[PDB]
Amino acid sequence: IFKVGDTVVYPHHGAALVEAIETRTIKGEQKEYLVLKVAQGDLTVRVPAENAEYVGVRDVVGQEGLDKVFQVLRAPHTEEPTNWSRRYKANLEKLASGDVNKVAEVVRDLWRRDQERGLSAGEKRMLAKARQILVGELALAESTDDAKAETILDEVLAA
Amino acid sequence: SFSDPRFDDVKAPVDECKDKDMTYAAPLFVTAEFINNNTGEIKSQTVFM
Amino acid sequence: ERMTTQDVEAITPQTLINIRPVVAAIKEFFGTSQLSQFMDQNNPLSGLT
C-alpha cells in the first residue's frame, strides 16, 4: 500500500512525504513504522503500517476528488444553525474529521460568510487553517504548485 | 519527552547589546517528542524554548 | 493540563509546550533577585572581587 516518496495525506496536517519504512522494533516485535514528515510544523511522524488506516493516513486524492469537492464547493442551498456556537462546534468537528469533502464544505461556507458579513478572529483563524490544509491537499493532488493552487481555488470560489 | 538542548549563535555581539540595551542572549532549541501509547506514534519537533 | 483537554490525533509539541512561564522565570531571576547583583566595577579589583 505504502512506498517511499509517496506524497501521502494525513489528518490534520495535510499531505506529507514518507521518508523510509522504519523497522524500529518494540518488545522484540519489528513493527514496520514509516517516518513521515510535513512541511508546515516541521515534524516527523512514525506510524505502524498495520493501524496506519486506523489512525487514518490516506492516499492523495484523484480527479473524481477535485470536481467532487468542487461540486461541493459549488454546491448551493447550504445553511447552518442560527446560534453560531452550534455552527462553530459543528464545523469544528467537520474540520476535525479531515475528510476532503467536509473541509471543502467548511471553507466554501466560511467563504460565503466572510464575503457577506465580516466575521470574527476565531472564525478567521478557522478559515485560515482549513484553507491552508485544503490548498496543500489540492496542490499535491493535482501537483500544481501551492501559489498556483491558491489562485485556482480563488478562481473556483467566485464560480 | 524532551532531549538534546542546543544553542544557536548569539543574535548580537557584546558591545552592540550593551549600547542598544539588548540583553546578550542566545536561543534554546529542544527536540521535543510526543508519543501516544494506544495507537503508537512519535511526534518529534525542534521547539524554540 | 492541556494533555487531556486537547483532542487526540490532532496535537503536537508545538501545540503543547508553553514557553512563556519558562522565559519569565529566567527574566525574573536575572532581573530583581538579590543574587543577580549589579556589577560593581569602579576598578578592576572590585570587578574581579
Side-chain angles (χ1 to χ4, degrees):
Chain A
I1 297 171
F2 296 102
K3 296 177 290 296
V4 71
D6 297 337
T7 66
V8 70
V9 180
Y10 178 71
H12 299 170
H13 307 287
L17 291 173
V18 289
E19 187 173 2
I21 299 96
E22 188 67 29
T23 66
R24 191 264 304 277
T25 183
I26 179 167
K27 196 60 181 176
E29 295 166 352
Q30 290 82 18
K31 272 80 170 179
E32 299 297 322
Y33 283 97
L34 44 94
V35 47
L36 182 145
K37 62 183 291 295
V38 308
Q40 183 179 3
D42 294 332
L43 69 154
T44 63
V45 180
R46 278 82 172 274
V47 171
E50 292 183 354
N51 51 3
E53 68 271 15
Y54 288 160
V55 74
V57 67
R58 190 264 313 276
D59 197 0
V60 73
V61 176
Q63 289 85 17
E64 52 318 49
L66 214 211
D67 66 53
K68 207 322 139 133
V69 287
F70 262 167
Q71 183 175 1
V72 173
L73 192 143
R74 272 76 172 271
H77 191 72
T78 301
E79 67 97 23
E80 288 292 326
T82 63
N83 241 237
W84 79 279
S85 179
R86 295 184 65 85
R87 174 182 295 118
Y88 182 76
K89 189 178 262 78
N91 60 10
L92 183 60
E93 186 173 359
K94 293 179 73 68
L95 192 274
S97 66
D99 183 72
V100 185
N101 303 110
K102 295 182 183 293
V103 171
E105 198 279 336
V106 167
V107 298
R108 68 103 172 84
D109 197 2
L110 217 288
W111 180 254
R112 290 180 184 180
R113 284 188 68 195
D114 64 351
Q115 181 178 0
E116 178 67 30
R117 177 64 59 85
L119 264 55
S120 176
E123 285 172 345
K124 183 176 73 176
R125 180 175 62 188
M126 183 64 202
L127 181 140
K129 180 180 178 180
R131 177 186 290 273
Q132 194 279 130
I133 60 99
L134 196 274
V135 158
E137 198 275 329
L138 292 181
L140 288 178
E142 193 185 1
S143 69
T144 177
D145 292 331
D146 297 330
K148 181 66 69 178
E150 282 286 338
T151 58
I152 196 166
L153 188 144
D154 295 331
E155 189 269 330
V156 299
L157 285 171
Chain B
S1 178
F2 296 98
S3 175
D4 190 75
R6 182 177 63 248
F7 290 95
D8 291 332
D9 292 331
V10 297
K11 61 176 68 65
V14 174
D15 199 1
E16 182 173 359
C17 288
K18 190 180 288 183
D19 193 2
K20 299 179 178 66
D21 293 337
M22 292 176 67
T23 171
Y24 178 74
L28 278 169
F29 283 165
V30 170
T31 303
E33 182 183 3
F34 178 75
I35 296 167
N36 205 166
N37 289 318
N38 52 4
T39 165
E41 295 88 5
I42 65 166
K43 259 64 183 301
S44 296
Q45 292 177 355
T46 303
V47 178
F48 177 79
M49 190 60 70
Chain C
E1 191 273 335
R2 67 181 63 186
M3 192 177 288
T4 63
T5 63
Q6 287 292 324
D7 50 350
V8 196
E9 292 94 7
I11 48 94
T12 191
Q14 187 66 41
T15 56
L16 291 175
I17 298 170
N18 204 171
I19 47 94
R20 182 172 62 86
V22 171
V23 64
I26 300 170
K27 195 267 298 296
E28 73 98 20
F29 174 71
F30 283 98
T32 70
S33 176
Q34 61 187 356
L35 274 74
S36 177
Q37 294 183 358
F38 194 69
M39 172 60 185
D40 182 74
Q41 48 183 357
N42 48 5
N43 48 358
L45 187 63
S46 171
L48 182 66
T49 321

